[PDB]
Amino acid sequence: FQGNPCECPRALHRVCGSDGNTYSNPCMLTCAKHEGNPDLVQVHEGPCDEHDHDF
């Protein structure tokens, strides 16, 4: 679980996973998922956080 799931570009296509946890792109989500995150799911695209990942 490395390099098989993740190969996609550094596209800033920010999205959200089920935790509300924003991802840099939905390609890293599915990657992560198939890598070591069987609990992750493509809930839906678009970021859940405002525009950042911190208080």
Structure description:
The protein is an alpha+beta fold and about 55 residues long. The chain has a single domain, classed as 2-Layer Sandwich (Wheat Germ Agglutinin (Isolectin 2), domain 1), CATH 3.30.60.30. About 20% of the residues lie in helices and about 5% in strands. The protein has one helix and two strands, in the order E-E-H. It has one helix at about 25-35; strands spanning about 15, 20-25. The protein has a two-stranded antiparallel ribbon with strand order 1-2. The radius of gyration is 11 Å and the shape is globular. The protein starts with 14 loop residues before the first strand and ends in a 19-residue tail after the last helix.
In terms of topology, how is this protein built?
Blueprint: E1 15-16, E2 22-23, H1 26-36
Antiparallel strand pairs: 1-2
Subcellular location: Secreted
Domain Kazal-like: 1-50
Protein name: Serine protease inhibitor dipetalogastin
Defining traits:
monomer, 55 residues, alpha+beta, Wheat Germ Agglutinin (Isolectin 2), domain 1, two-stranded antiparallel sheet, 1 helix, 2 strands, 20% helix, Serine protease inhibitor dipetalogastin, blood clotting
